[PDB]
A paper describes a structure:
We crystallized and determined a 2.3 Å resolution crystal structure of Pa CapW in a low-pH condition (pH 5.0). The structure reveals that Pa CapW shares the same overall architecture as Sm CapW, forming a homodimer of protomers with wHTH, WYL, and WCX domains. The symmetric arrangement of WYL domains linked by WCX domains is similar to Sm CapW, but in Pa CapW the WYL domains are each rotated ∼10° downward and inward toward the wHTH domains. This motion is accompanied by a slight widening of the groove between the WYL domains’ ligand-binding sites and bordered by the two WCX domains, and also by a rearrangement of the C-termini of each WCX domain. In Pa CapW, this region undergoes a domain swap to fold against the opposite protomer's WCX domain. Finally, we observe that a salt bridge between a conserved arginine in the WYL domain and an aspartate on the WCX domain is broken in the Pa CapW structure, enabling the WCX domain to move out and away from the dimer-related WYL domain. In our structure of Pa CapW, the WYL domains pinch inward by ∼6 Å, positioning the equivalent tryptophan residues (Trp181) and the nearby α5 helices too close to one another to accommodate the α4 helices in their original configuration. As a result, the α4 helix of each CapW protomer rotates downward away from the WYL domains. This change, and the motion of the WYL domains in general, in turn cause a striking ∼70° rotation of each wHTH domain compared to its position in Sm CapW. Whereas the wHTH domains are aligned for cooperative DNA binding in our structure of Sm CapW, in Pa CapW they are completely misaligned and would be unable to bind a contiguous DNA sequence.
Residue numbers in the entry:
A (entry chain A), B (entry chain A): 16 to 107, 123 to 273, 276 to 298
């Protein structure tokens, strides 16, 4: 009722805050288009956003948009994540492809977050298709990493004496067991910044070569992205350059009837 | 201040609501581990959740967890999306791989949502690497589809007289232009349910064959997933079965220095 209305309105205020942060402006008809609300309601939402931050935005009468002011500081922490729009879209017409992969375990994630926050020791049972028997492992983690769909923890392995990555869905048990020293400054790969230069794939026709350079805002046929050395492997996966242990276990399934399901594709 | 505290607490109430929906229970130490709050605060959060739905949960003194009651109905719409935990993790230690892909355009998404809601005509400029020149197109959409990272719109193409998929980042312009008739019941592929049977990949050793069947809860070495015919192609991408037009444009980049960046991988 009222709680459902205040909850729904709060997401629209986060939409406003997001649009101002990333696009620099918002139209009243953006709210009506996106959420299916009336023009009056969109006017109430904009007024409510202004009560939280009176100088975050300003109406431009000629253009008929609200623009982010010079003093704009986002009101909600959610505005900082680029993909938050995807979440707003998914929560407030929309359909999903079936996810084959395993579901993230909130208990294991919580223990790892605690251990990162407190620089703790954790004892895990890690089990992978590369070593099916699995084994217990002693880790000191210092970062939880999002790779599109997949999560992995960056941690110090103590028997092995090196910093490594561990896929969250391959962690079957996770227990906090002690307090450690901070090691983050010894993970050189994690801290070394690499300037990755991308160009349009050789072989593209002139037209698709110019399209891709326009789509990715390249200067002189080049694009620059800063990556930590310990994350290069994950960036290259997006370009489909490698294919191996650190990809999902879903890849290791197979269709019982590959002939019959292929016919059904159109 | 107070607004920041009520906003932060609301995410913890959504965590509670999510855990009850998906895991059936929540521990007080789950809140403290995940959010870094004090035990007293976690007690205040649980009490606040109970005020919204007094019978959604019940404390089990022996196990020391709050369990979802028989009458549990989620309090927040966000609890319905499995991947909402990933969003809570990303908003409230955490790092991200650089996203190479283009950012979702909220204006275009809003026009498409409006057209789906109102069964409208839309006029788009669609531009792809398969046809670089691009072209204007007349579409009547009826679903917005999430495929992990990627979005596409399922729509009726009128010059072509068929239902097709259109990647959202390849839509460069989108305008609502008219009102249409409802066509959803004529999209047979979208409405035809397919029972996809998956098995462990042939060739796996006995150990990794049993691991994967335990990980995906298979009965008799088999797994069943319902897919709409018009979504089979996207399910097969997760198994890496095809590789082509409907994958990201990012795949069509290349590393300027493939030798130097390969050395840096460890």
């Amino acid at each position: 009722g009222r709680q459902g209305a205040r909850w729904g309105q709060e997401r629209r205020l986060e939409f406003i805050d997001y649009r101002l942060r990333w696009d620099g402006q918002i139209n009243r008809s953006s709210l009506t288009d996106f959420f299916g609300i009336s023009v009056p309601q969109a006017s109430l939402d904009i007024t409510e956003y202004a009560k939280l931050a009176e100088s975050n935005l300003e109406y431009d009468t000629r253009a008929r948009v609200y623009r982010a002011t010079e003093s704009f500081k986002a009101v909600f922490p959610s505005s900082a994540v680029e993909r938050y729009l995807d979440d707003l879209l998914r929560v407030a017409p929309v359909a999903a492809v079936p996810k084959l992969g395993r579901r993230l375990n909130a208990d294991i994630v919580g223990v790892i977050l605690r251990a990162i926050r407190e620089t703790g020791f954790i004892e895990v049972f890690y089990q992978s298709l590369t070593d099916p028997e699995g084994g217990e492992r002693m880790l000191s983690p210092h970062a939880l990493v999002h790779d599109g769909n997949r999560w992995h923890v960056r941690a110090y392995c103590h028997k092995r004496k090196a910093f490594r990555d561990f896929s969250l869905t391959r962690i079957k048990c996770c227990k906090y067991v002690g307090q450690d020293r901070d090691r983050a400054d010894e993970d050189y790969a994690w801290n070394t910044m690499v300037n990755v230069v991308l160009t349009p794939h050789p072989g593209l026709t002139p037209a698709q070569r110019k399209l891709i350079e326009n789509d990715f805002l390249m200067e002189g046929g080049e694009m620059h992205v800063e990556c930590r050395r310990a994350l290069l492997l994950y960036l290259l996966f997006q370009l489909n350059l490698n294919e191996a242990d650190q990809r999902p276990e879903v890849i290791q399934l197979a269709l019982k009837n590959r002939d019959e399901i292929k016919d059904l594709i159109q």
